[PDB]
């Protein structure tokens, strides 16, 4: 996250790190003790059997006893279009069931179809780069953002740090967008580069898939 702050340790227990050979490459969201919800393109080109879902971490670079690690067993898509970045949502079933505690909890998703109008206050998070050309995050980053509708299409949830150059960066794909206590968006793509200050960042609209998500996790 570019232009954010260090997050209170485990202030977001539903926050998930996806790692390939010990290296973070996408975020995810814990939606059920054996299902994480992430971006569809994070897993579209990767060796799924090498991905390791890491729950309840905070400082990715140091040893944390609160961590729990799982493999991916099954994948659930809902019509992802890599040409137009549409339906950028995926649900990964884990090789086990996480133990819910203070550091690991299940997130709350909105009602099906509930759309956020312009101006709503949200919170983007993730271990993405701290700055374009600056490097990956070691501590979870959070950032107050505002929902926008201009320069956006109905197929996405768009946010914009207003008046500054700040926003999501690379490695923030799959990380949740929390508004009013609900995961309303999975981070998908930026325009022009990280923290352009001109073009809103784009999230997959979770609230449009609640029905499809419920049928998966049951």
């Amino acid at each position: 996250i570019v232009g954010g702050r260090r997050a209170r340790p485990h202030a977001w227990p539903f926050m998930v790190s996806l790692q390939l050979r010990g290296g973070h490459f996408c975020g995810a969201t814990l939606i059920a003790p054996n299902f994480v919800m992430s971006a569809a393109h994070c897993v579209a080109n990767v060796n799924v059997r090498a991905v390791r879902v890491v729950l309840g971490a905070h400082n990715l670079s140091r040893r944390e006893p609160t961590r729990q690690v799982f493999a991916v067993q099954r994948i659930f898509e809902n019509g992802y279009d890599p040409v137009n970045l549409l339906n950028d949502i995926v649900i990964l079933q884990l090789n086990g069931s996480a133990t819910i505690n203070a550091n690991v909890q299940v997130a709350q998703l909105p009602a099906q179809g509930r759309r956020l109008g312009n101006g709503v206050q949200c919170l983007a998070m993730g271990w993405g780069l701290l700055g374009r050309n600056r490097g990956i995050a070691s501590v979870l980053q959070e950032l107050n953002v505002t929902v926008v509708t201009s320069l956006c299409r109905r197929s996405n949830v768009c946010t914009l740090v207003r008046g500054r150059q700040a926003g999501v960066c690379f490695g923030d794909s799959g990380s949740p967008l929390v508004c009013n206590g609900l995961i309303h968006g999975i981070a998908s793509f930026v325009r022009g580069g990280c923290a352009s200050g001109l073009y809103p960042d784009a999230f997959a609209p979770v609230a449009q898939f609640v029905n499809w998500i419920d049928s998966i996790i049951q």
Partner: protein, 99 residues
Amino acid sequence: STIQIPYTITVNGTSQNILSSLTFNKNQNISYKDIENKVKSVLYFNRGISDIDLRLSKQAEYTVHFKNGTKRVIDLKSGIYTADLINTSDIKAISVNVD
């Protein structure tokens, strides 16, 4: 410490018969913007394709081929980047096509 990922550039319907490869670090996650600046690089060094030629091209795209058999087709005239990282050691080759 570093690896060589081979690439091929075909502009206007012709591709040079050269064996050309870029330089990436061994086992490192990078973004699709890192890759774009290296594609726009060899696009100029090999066949004189500048930023103005891309903007005025009929279409301009490149394709990351991964070693597992899957690929990802990137639109060079789109300016859009999925906020993900990909590991350099998983990339099989890159192909570039411009008109």
